[PDB]
């Protein structure tokens, strides 16, 4: 009906309309958005956005740390059965080992069977890149131009084994022993130089093997790019759907054998966490494109008119709403995996395995040992705790973001007429 009988009931609205008419209050609100933007995209420990990115990525890594030791893999480079082919990937979490062996012969790679070596190559590379970056520490979300260097090895023995043949890498026909090739590769739209080198080794009393070294120079470490790597890791597991079987007083794996894509509730959560972090990282560009540091007021030195001097308000609203979205999504990521709200086999998988570390003493993130297998070793519990801590310490900033969203919303309304 009329404004008074309305403000009788909703007195915090009267106060809002008063702030919306006062430049000193509008500018105070804009200073605040400036500051909370910095907490969100310029900080690390105290940013919920950062902790949520880090959690999504660590969940992916942790899932493979738990289950890789038990995953069948093998065959030759053409994706077919091999007779006698042993292919060993270094710095992976295998049974009592820092390497995973793929030497399942005779059976044909594919669904409900052994993972082909082409897939394991895709999986490995993403794993080495993620663990390398986890080790050096993830950058703040605004820093999206950084790079790192990544290096990893794998070997081939057995007669018939085509997995390290030089034509696969563009190295000469000769040149398995000593040959090398340097070649730009394309990763998340950026240009990476990659050197691939081959040597033959002939030990004293045991079989000859080829060793391949991959050196990736200028890999991007931005949140966007590392989320793409996590996505490759978990999608390759889920699409290839290989067979696994576990060596089980202590925690109980459910199911104990079968196909890996059969952890549907776990892979769907992981994929949703990644998706939610991708969309969270995309608010970064909306914040940057609507900076709030220019002060506002009336003009020709007249007093401020909220119905005509407020064309800045659409920007202010977009900036505030984006921040509120980064906060809600960060919280969503954590709730998808927090064991306090899980049941059944899923809860058991998380508290039993994913959120634990059997490595020897807690060594730094990104670290594989002979005792990594069957546990997550990706700081999943500590990351949950720190997400919650950052959120508790964002109490005031969340309230300021809401006030600036309300002020800008009021001004946008006034200015339609």
């Amino acid at each position: 009906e009329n404004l008074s009988k309305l403000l009788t009931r909703y007195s915090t609205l009267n106060t809002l309309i008063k702030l919306s008419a006062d430049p000193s209050a509008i500018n105070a609100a804009r200073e605040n958005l400036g500051a909370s933007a910095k907490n969100l995209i310029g900080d690390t420990k105290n940013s919920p956005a950062y902790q949520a990115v880090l959690l999504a990525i660590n969940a992916a890594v942790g899932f493979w740390n738990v289950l890789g030791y038990a995953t069948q893999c093998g065959g030759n480079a053409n994706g077919q059965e091999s007779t006698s082919s042993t292919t060993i990937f270094n710095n992976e979490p295998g049974y009592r080992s820092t390497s995973i062996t793929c030497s399942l012969n005779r059976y044909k790679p594919g669904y409900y069977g052994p993972m082909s070596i082409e897939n394991f190559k895709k999986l490995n590379e993403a794993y080495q890149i993620l663990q390398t970056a986890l080790n050096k520490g993830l950058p703040a979300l605004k820093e999206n131009n950084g790079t790192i260097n990544v290096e990893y090895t794998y070997t081939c023995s057995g007669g018939g084994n085509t997995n390290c043949d030089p034509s696969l890498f563009g190295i000469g026909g000769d040149g398995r022993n000593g040959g090398s090739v340097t070649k730009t590769q394309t990763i998340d739209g950026k240009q990476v130089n990659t050197t691939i080198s081959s040597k033959v080794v002939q030990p004293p009393h045991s079989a000859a093997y080829t060793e391949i070294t991959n050196a990736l120079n200028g890999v991007p470490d931005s949140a966007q790019a590392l989320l793409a790597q996590a996505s490759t890791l978990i999608n390759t597991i889920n699409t290839a759907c290989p067979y696994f079987s576990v060596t089980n007083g202590g925690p109980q794996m459910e199911p104990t054998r079968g196909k890996l894509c059969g952890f549907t509730e776990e892979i769907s959560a992981i994929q949703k966490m990644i998706t939610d972090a991708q969309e969270l990282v995309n608010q970064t560009s909306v914040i940057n494109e609507h900076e709030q540091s220019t002060p506002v007021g009336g003009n020709n030195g007249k007093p401020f008119n909220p119905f005509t001097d407020a064309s800045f308000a659409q920007g202010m609203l977009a900036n505030a709403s984006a921040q509120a979205k980064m906060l809600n999504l960060a919280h969503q990521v954590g709730q998808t995996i927090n064991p306090d709200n899980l049941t059944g086999t899923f809860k058991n998988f998380v508290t039993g395995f994913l959120a634990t570390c059997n490595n020897k003493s807690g060594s730094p993130p990104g670290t594989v040992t002979t005792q990594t297998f069957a546990s997550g070793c990706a700081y999943v519990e500590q990351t949950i705790t720190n997400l919650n801590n950052s959120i508790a310490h964002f109490g005031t900033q969340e309230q300021q973001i809401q006030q600036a969203e309300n002020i800008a919303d009021t001004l946008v309304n006034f200015g339609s007429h």
Partner: nanobody
Amino acid sequence: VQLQESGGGLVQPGGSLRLSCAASGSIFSGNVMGWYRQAPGKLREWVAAITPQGVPNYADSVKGRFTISRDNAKNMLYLQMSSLKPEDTALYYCNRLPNYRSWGQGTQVTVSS
């Protein structure tokens, strides 16, 4: 999906109070929870918060006088106020952090000489 505050009333400066909030499990469980107030002529102000594992943190205006706490078995949040001043007068409210869409009725606290 429900928030119910209680325990408030009129007290004397230097006096003391205990507020309770009853929350539904879907809000409470596994979530940071916190307390807020809205004083006359102002917008809602954040007061205190506490993580599921029990770690508290407070706004500068109340630090050293208020204690926040939670009971995870019964879905309850509490706020214990000491050394109260007139400036602490307001409608007190509870929620999770980040905030659920809909607020409860709150509980009135008044401090008057």
